[PDB]
């Protein structure tokens, strides 16, 4: 499912070593470290990112992203 599609509004590095990102108006977190430097770059240059997941509410995990 395409949960959100847009620019990364902001991003948080968390104490549990997960990475949170804010797309459209909703927050999403990923526990995959590999996604950290890729996502911070998409945010740097306003790359349109699209978070994919099974649970699409704000506060949900993902481990799938399309970079446009």
**Cβ within 8 Å of residue 3, ≥6 positions away:** 23, 26, 28, 51, 52, 53, 56, 60, 62
Near its own copies by CB under 8 A: residue from 2, 55, 58, 66: 66
SS3 at position 39: helix
Could you tell me the smallest distance in angstroms from the CB atom of residue 38 to another protein?
6
Are 49 and 67 spatial neighbours (Cβ–Cβ below 8 Å)?
Answer: yes
Identify the residue among 26, 47, 56, 60 touching its own copies (CB under 8 A): 47
Could you say which of its own copies, another protein, none residue 18 binds, taking C-beta under 5 to 8 angstroms by partner kind? another protein
Binding site residues, its own copies, CB under 8 A: 10-15, 17, 32-38, 40-45, 47, 63-68
């Amino acid at each position: 499912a395409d949960c959100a599609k847009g620019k990364i509004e902001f991003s948080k590095y968390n104490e549990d070593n997960t990475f949170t990102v804010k797309v459209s108006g909703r927050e999403y977190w990923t526990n995959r470290w590999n996604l950290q430097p890729l996502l911070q770059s998409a945010q740097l240059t306003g790359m349109t990112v699209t978070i994919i997941s099974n649970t699409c509410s704000s506060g949900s995990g993902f481990a799938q992203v399309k970079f446009n």
